[PDB]
């Protein structure tokens, strides 16, 4: 048009876009700074950083960008370019990122009054500590500081502005719990002057859904899949090729969960110690089922059966469980019925060995079962929130 | 030329790339707007992102580029790079990208009247909600929205053109259902004027021909192998040496399905808990086999025959399922009948054991098949669009 | 020197970089395009993209950039960077890549007439269609279309010249069967002028080497392993153990080989189905010799031998395959020679059963081998230029 | 404002970016450098690089930038952006970079005096060699290498300051010990003029709880685990049912070891031999066991029990254990007696050789544990700083 | 300073940067090349690329940047930035990269005589052609060519020096043998002048210390394993059990070996055939073994030992291998006599037949040990630098 033509004529003239747009050069100029978060991208537990989806908001006075509306009745604001008028340096410190700013500078929107807003979105990647002593139950809290980067508490003050969740697309995989701010002063021993800052703090919670479904579940259905073995009668002969198999069919289910559990050195995750406990109880039980066979395949004429294996397995474990011419004719034949005798007494001694295997098993099968459930539901009700987030979780 | 030389040198004399192209600064610049798409690159569901290839395409009129043909008659077109005329900032706002344009600002053509059209190409990567509750058969709508960054309705206002789907060139797994418009307007309480907006809804649909035939039939094979187990005699010493390899076997057969299967927590895919069925029935299929060769290789002196068991497994259950000196000599002799009388009567309660064995074999038999049948054809019949998916893409 | 600063000080002189150097503004600008390919980069099949090295090649006039080179003698030929002199605006239609244009513009080289050469090298991302019925003898047919953007052809009209495939570098794993060229024109019903394009199709067969040796001959030999089941005999107690243990040695090479096949969803891949028989025949295997072990398992007084069983399985295909006091004493003595004679009519019976069960075994034996050799012959001899591809890949 | 508008445009007035800012342009300039670790990202020994958070620090002093502070009483600081004032050129020498710079230029803030400071921060990667001879217990020493580019020690002479570790967000993979600086001066026999750089030494040291846990405990359990083939009586028919499945079980734990391990062939690392002792000792106790059921399974008419064999095995060996008408009828029934005397005598000897299998058993047990304890412990306690580590780490 | 500022602003006048900085324009610019070779990054067999780190070195002489030292008693040197004085346009022709520069140019460096030094460093991405048919044992040559590209031979003639090797970080899996270079000149018949262009072939051998202790032992381990099959005697039942278990044991192998063996399909690796004939053997052993059994488990009565049978494997191969009323109680007791001596000539028959099968055993050990013996030297000792290989990187 006519008039906004002349308008940015004479609104760029004599203009500096490195002064500071004040009119006293001795008093602050406020700047009011929000956030407003958009989605939760990545959290990433290797090099510790956050990836998320944020537009920042600023907005503050300009003294050289006022006009009458009067003079000019068609135009109320005005837009200008990046590097054409003054604007705040205010970016994040932690700014883990390969080019450290990520913010796409956008236009500059002035009223008729010189009040500027300015507000770029962007992606960013900050850095945050992560604990993941409770892997699948886990809370985090990180944080994101802005602050300007080379003006002072007398030139240029931060002020702090509620954050906007409207519109969050939720994760799907991160629960989000919240995020507050605060601003903060440090002085330093050099200036008495404030250098002030405004910072953000995400506190987010871990969804465990996925993981009491994909891993938990297939591994109490072998840990429970072995002691089978114990039901299994010793006269078939397969009770290592079911015990050994157990133990084969889950160490090639660790090759799905490796995929899974992180790989920091600092602590022990839960999950680790679980699948640690499942590990050996898993392969402590082919153990037991070798002392069994060994009492089941005793030879007859080898042993003694001490008396102590008779009255522990036999008398009082056994009682818990409640289980409970004509003279060369006739000299041929007395051989023959002696030798059936000798088989007899033999089979009667074998008897009483495969009686007492058969006590070891039971016994043996008593105490592994407990053991389990002790294990598996301690280990997992030692997380705190737990009923927290069984609660919010599956029900 | 002599003529398209001046032409240059007159059009670009006392222009502001920085004003609205209008003649009176009160009335809007009419902007017409249309999009072209050229396919479809990615959907990930773990970012929750659509990458797509598109063409916007935006026409309008300018006031200061007005030429006559007579009086240079060689030129009717004119050509204009970025930064040189004047460009609506009609930008995406979802973009969830680096960058944040994507845009490759190209050439603007402008005609001997004003004309202006402006299309620039480029890869979109937009961000919308993906609901996986149905893995295979999915369907799943995104939208794109596009509007002015700085402008109002007094000002820009945005008009609506039909897309235009002429080569789409066709994914190949997800199935393109259609591509409406929308144009809105959205007052707010400090100004009484439009912001109008354009949205873009593309609907699309997931294709289940590989999913059925390299994940379901393989293991339809594998589920119906372990039945195989209630037909097999227990006088071969393989009974558990072929339930423990199909399970161990099929262990193996979740590390290729892992790489599929989606790992969000907010709810629970079919596939998922088709997996999870087939895996408890394969397991639940092994304990069984254990309660058979108990009753199969019982001592002959240990057991009494409960008369229950005797009613229920031999009588009503095997009926449905229609399954039916001299003194010397003669003492020694008639002392090995007596023992060859003794084996027979073991030996026949032996025999009466396995029946109950075998009788117990084939009622297991008739149930899980019935089992497994009723959980495949319910759980993937249970999904919408079952049937629209099949005859789309089988047939 | 001092002779081409003077010239190249006046060359630039009231010169415009956006107007089309023509003497008339009336008559076209002949534009002479050609194309020289490198090597082939990739082919991906998910994207549906090809990126490939390639060198444009572009040529023209221009008028303003004449000089005499008797005033000049020093100086024959000149250089101009980018941005300075006007270049033709010919650019890629497909150009699935991010940022569109993947040129690198270098220097323009002029001559002392104004012929003007310049010529890009750059890697070309484009898109084109990839069919996958036949994956192992795979043709592919992939357009390069180049034109201009914003010129019509009564301004800048294309010409072709032949490709240039000297120093091709072979991929290895493409077979480059050609590229040919072609210049097309587009008529529009608004303007009447046409709007000329070049296209190159790149035409490319796959090799078939590693595919025939890594996943093919692997296959043949655990696919042909099972078949010995067949000629084990079942006195030995591993039957199941050699049939079920060949499935998951093979279930775990198909860990290897979905890595290789394609995840596209329009089609069924040769190689696919190949796999699938395979998997059907190796499945099949293991239900067959359950039933032969019921037959050699068969108790000897629990059935009746049908006579169906007895003329099919003993008389027909068995000869196709061509198989082939003193009372008390004597009493005692009786019984003791009675039972010998009841256990012989046994073993008569369980042995007439077990010649069934090896005539089951042999017939079983013929058949499958057909099964697998007509399937593995016919499902690769379907597929065209099989014969070519054997001939110009193995041999 | 007013005043600082002012100073501004006098004090870029004849301003020369190019020059050195000095008064006399034959004495050095000092410009003093330190460093500032914010974190350790990664350690790569593929490409041999290190990816660290980095933010440098420079001061030096301008001549031409100096204000009298009564005549502005309102300003005391100014700021230049990247391209208007003098800054040195000291970059990284080893920036194995793509852009070689990553240091993302900020801007220049001046005091009234002229001393000026600048600090941009950027991640670098630097190329240092990394030894890997001791794998999970390992110290790594880098450098990184700074001076100016092309200045002279009498033009810009670099100073030290030492580095700062406060916020250093410990990484949880490499425990840093320390990082100290050192300066240096390289003449060359041209100028007779020294050329200063400073180098900071980053030393190191891994974390060894994941590995500790993860890795070794696992292949302890499956080790100590085939041990048991020696305490299971070779009666049951699984022996190499057992010794064979733990060996594939651990075939199948060097697929998750395979991820972990370095492929630098320059040496061999502690936990690759440690792993292929494992492998030897496992696949060596398989071949003891065919030579142990080759004196259990010997013909009673096909052996003589060699001598030395009967002394060996039988007496020293197994004392360090502490193991220890009428007519035809009398023919008949001597010639069944006889029958009855020659099985009793086979038996026997089967009986002999089977002792003297369990002699070997009972062996061979005896040694392979103080094989595997005396290389378990000898492997690991070899390396270096091991008690260091451990105490460290674990406790 | 005040004399270097004026220095300054006198050289850049009337100073054209597109000018070659000669003294009469019809004499050759003569431009010294060099380059220095700090690390070889990586070798890529996919894209056939090389990616090294260079430092290029140029120098030249200008005419126009001289001046009189004694006027300017301050300055020796000037430093100009990147488009401000003329450069020359030497590039690398391969350049298979997406950018075709990565150069980075740094400041030009220019002495009191105008004598100019330029010397950018970069990352380089050549591309050249990789020969794997020798995998572990390899040598290559790649080439990088650099030269001038819009310069003839009579305006700018390039000049060769030395390499430099100072420097060099050893890589850990390549060998460096060494980088020799050589100037060469093309001539075309439409002009007469020659194009100089120089060349340096990096020459480069593998190092096959990691293969040879990860992939080779590991499967000389398992194909010495399967051979144990035939010491174990047939009585126990597991002979498949063990011969099935080392090929199942053996395929999981593949999955590791799978991701290290290159995918191109112009010739077949000697890694791939040594796998093949591993592979081969292991499967053909399994065959011999079911051939073994069929002689042991041979019925009684069913076959008749042919003469050719009796002949083969019991006199001449058992040689080489040094193997070698009272009427019917007597009636009664004469069946039960007769019945014990049909079944001891029963016996008798299936020990012949035991011992043929033991013959066939060791016959088929004597030679399947050969077999793998001569494969394995043969197939490792065909390569050539096989002892070149072994001396350098081994001992
Ligand atoms: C401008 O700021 C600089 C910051 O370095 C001041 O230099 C330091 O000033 C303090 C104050 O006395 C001294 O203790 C330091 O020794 C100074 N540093 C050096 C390297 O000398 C400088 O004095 C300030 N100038 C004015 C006029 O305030
Ligand atoms: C400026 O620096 C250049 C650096 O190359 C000097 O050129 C070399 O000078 C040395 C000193 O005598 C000679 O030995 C070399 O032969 C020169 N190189 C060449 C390629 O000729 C140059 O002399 C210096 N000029 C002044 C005035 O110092
Ligand atoms: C600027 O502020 C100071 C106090 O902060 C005041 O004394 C001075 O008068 C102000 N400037 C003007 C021009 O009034």
Same mark, same amino acid.
């Given at each position: 048009?006519?008039?906004?033509?002349? @308008?940015?004529?004479?609104?760029?003239?004599?203009?500096?876009?490195?002064?500071?747009?004040?009119? *006293?050069?001795?008093?602050?100029?406020?700047?009011?700074?929000?956030?407003?978060?958009?989605?939760?991208?990545?959290?990433?537990?290797?090099?510790?950083?956050? %990836?998320?989806?944020?537009?920042?908001?600023?907005? /503050?006075?300009?003294?050289?960008?006022? /006009?009458?509306?009067?003079?000019?009745?068609?135009?109320?604001?005005?837009?200008?370019?990046?590097?054409?008028?003054?604007?705040?340096?205010?970016?994040?410190?932690?700014?883990?990122?390969?080019?450290?700013?990520?913010?796409?500078?956008?236009?500059?929107?002035?009223?008729?009054?010189?009040?500027?807003?300015?507000?770029?979105?962007?992606?960013?990647?900050?850095?945050?500590? +992560?604990?993941?002593?409770?892997?699948?139950?886990?809370?985090?809290?990180?944080?994101?500081?802005?602050? #300007?980067?080379?003006?002072? &508490? /007398?030139?240029?003050?931060?002020? $702090?502005?509620?954050?906007? +969740?409207?519109?969050?697309?939720? *994760?799907?995989?991160?629960?989000?719990?919240?995020?507050?701010?605060?601003?903060?002063?440090?002085?330093?021993?050099?200036?008495?002057?404030?250098?002030?800052?405004?910072?953000?703090?995400?506190?987010?919670?871990?969804?465990?859904?996925?993981?009491?479904?994909?891993?938990?579940?297939?591994?109490?259905?072998?840990?429970?899949?072995?002691?089978?073995?114990?039901?299994?009668?010793?006269? #078939?002969?397969?009770? +290592?090729?079911?015990?050994? %198999?157990?133990?084969?069919?889950?160490?090639?289910?660790?090759?799905?969960?490796?995929?899974?559990?992180?790989?920091?050195?600092?602590?022990?995750?839960?999950?680790?110690?679980?699948?640690?406990?499942? $590990?050996?109880?898993? &392969?402590?039980?082919?153990?037991?089922?070798?002392?069994?066979?060994?009492?089941?395949?005793?030879?007859?004429?080898?042993?003694? $059966?001490?008396?102590?294996?008779?009255?522990?397995?036999?008398? /009082?474990?056994?009682?818990? @469980?409640? $289980?409970?011419?004509?003279?060369?004719?006739?000299?041929?034949?007395?051989? +023959?019925?002696?030798?059936?005798?000798?088989?007899?007494?033999?089979?009667?001694?074998?008897?009483?060995?495969?009686?007492?295997?058969?006590?070891?098993?039971?016994?043996?099968?008593?105490?592994?079962?407990?053991?389990?459930?002790?294990?598996?539901?301690?280990?997992?009700?030692?997380?705190?929130?737990?009923?927290?987030?069984?609660?919010?979780?599956?029900?």
């Amino acid at each position: 048009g006519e008039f906004q033509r002349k @308008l940015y004529k004479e609104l760029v003239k004599n203009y500096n876009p490195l002064e500071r747009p004040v009119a *006293n050069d001795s008093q602050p100029l406020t700047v009011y700074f929000s956030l407003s978060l958009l989605q939760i991208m990545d959290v990433d537990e290797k090099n510790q950083v956050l %990836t998320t989806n944020i537009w920042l908001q600023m907005s /503050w006075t300009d003294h050289y960008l006022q /006009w009458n509306v009067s003079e000019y009745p068609g135009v109320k604001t005005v837009r200008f370019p990046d590097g054409q008028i003054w604007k705040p340096d205010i970016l994040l410190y932690n700014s883990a990122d390969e080019r450290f700013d990520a913010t796409f500078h956008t236009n500059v929107l002035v009223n008729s009054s010189g009040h500027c807003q300015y507000l770029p979105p962007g992606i960013f990647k900050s850095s945050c500590y +992560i604990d993941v002593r409770w892997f699948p139950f886990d809370v985090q809290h990180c944080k994101l500081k802005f602050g #300007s980067w080379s003006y002072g &508490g /007398w030139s240029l003050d931060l002020q $702090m502005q509620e954050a906007d +969740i409207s519109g969050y697309i939720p *994760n799907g995989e991160w629960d989000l719990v919240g995020i507050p701010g605060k601003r903060s002063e440090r002085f330093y021993e050099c200036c008495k002057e404030p250098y002030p800052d405004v910072t953000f703090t995400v506190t987010m919670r871990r969804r465990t859904l996925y993981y009491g479904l994909n891993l938990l579940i297939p591994c109490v259905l072998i840990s429970a899949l072995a002691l089978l073995v114990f039901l299994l009668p010793a006269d #078939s002969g397969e009770k +290592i090729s079911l015990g050994i %198999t157990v133990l084969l069919s889950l160490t090639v289910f660790m090759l799905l969960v490796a995929e899974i559990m992180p790989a920091t050195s600092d602590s022990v995750p839960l999950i680790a110690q679980y699948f640690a406990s499942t $590990m050996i109880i898993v &392969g402590l039980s082919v153990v037991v089922t070798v002392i069994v066979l060994q009492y089941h395949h005793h030879d007859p004429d080898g042993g003694k $059966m001490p008396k102590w294996t008779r009255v522990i397995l036999l008398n /009082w474990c056994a009682w818990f @469980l409640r $289980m409970k011419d004509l003279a060369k004719i006739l000299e041929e034949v007395r051989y +023959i019925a002696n030798r059936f005798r000798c088989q007899d007494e033999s089979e009667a001694v074998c008897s009483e060995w495969k009686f007492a295997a058969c006590v070891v098993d039971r016994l043996c099968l008593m105490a592994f079962s407990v053991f389990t459930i002790i294990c598996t539901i301690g280990i997992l009700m030692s997380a705190p929130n737990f009923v927290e987030a069984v609660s919010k979780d599956f029900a």
